[PDB]
Each structure stands twice: as structure tokens, then as C-alpha cells.
Amino acid sequence: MESLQNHFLIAMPSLDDTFFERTVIYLCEHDEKGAMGLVINKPLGIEVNSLLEQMDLPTEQVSADLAMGSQVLMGGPVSQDRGFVLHTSQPYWANSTELGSGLMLTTSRDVLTAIGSKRSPDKFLVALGYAGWSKNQLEQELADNSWLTIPADHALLFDINHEDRWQQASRSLGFEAWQLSTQAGHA
């Protein structure tokens, strides 16, 4: 199981008195020796004001066409200007991406203006930024040290409420399949 990305990190509450360690973190990127991911500890609210501050600067973002926010999720302090938004699987919409079949990934901008006109698939969440693993790139050793690694599921990610997600994930079963290896185009 010594390969990060496309699965959750389960960390027992041995690391307490701090809100950044432990808990369930989902790694989406694969940086060879490391892997970038987003912490889905607990639903918190990053006010829309902070997004307004960001979108206000028309350099590499643009479009502050969003209506409201108040409770935006943060997956970490770095790349708070972007991150990645999750919704159920839909082969439509400008920004969608899925490895299997269950959900879709969207960039945190065009989805904000979509929030301006409330028309949801069924459920989704908006998270900005991710874990500062970029500075680490040592996730390999973290896996064998103490943290548990279990494969990611589309329902386990999204649809399994809040708390029972941990329970079911801790039960788990197994999965071993990597059918993806392509990178084309220069942009």
C-alpha cells in the first residue's frame, strides 16, 4: 500500500491538541515521492469576503460573479486562491473530471458564479486550498510510520454523511487497480 494518491489517510487521535494533524485527508495528486491532498476534517466556514479579496485582483483568476458564500471549506492554507471543488458525476459542465464513475472535479472559479444561480445536481461541496504537502514530499514514510491508507470510494467521499464515513472507511475491504497512465499536449 506504499503509494499515495486516490485514497484516504486515516490517522488515529494520537496527535491531539492540534488541528492540522490526524483526521481524514484525501490525496488527489501524485508527486512521486509525495502526494498533494485536501483535509476534510470538519465543515468550517471561510467567509465570502476572503474570496472577494482574491477575485478582486484580475491577474490569474477573474470573475467575481458569485452571489454569496460565507461557509466555504478550506482544505489547507496553500493555494487558497484555487483548490478543487467536488460534485456528483455529470458528463456535462465546462469543468468536470472523473477517474471512474461517481463524482466530478471542478476548479474554484466557474463554480462560484454557478452558485449565483442555485441549481444543484444533488449534493456537492466547495473547498479552497489544500495541504502543505508541497513543502513535505515525504508522504511515503508517513504511510508506513503510523497512518492508515485505504482506497477511495465515490460514495465514501461524498454521500456517507459525516461521521459514519470514518466508521465504514475503518472497516473497508480492499481494492487494487491502476488503469490510468497518459499525459499529452503541451499547455
UniProtKB/Swiss-Prot annotation:
Question: What GO cellular component entries does it have?
Answer: cytosol
The taxonomic lineage of its organism, from the top, reads: Bacteria, Pseudomonadati, Pseudomonadota, Gammaproteobacteria, Alteromonadales
Q: Which NCBIfam families match?
A: PRK00228.1-1
Name of one Pfam family that matches: DUF179
Family per similarity comment: Belongs to the UPF0301 (AlgH) family.
What protein name does the entry list?
Answer: UPF0301 protein SO_3346
This protein's superkingdom?
Answer: Bacteria
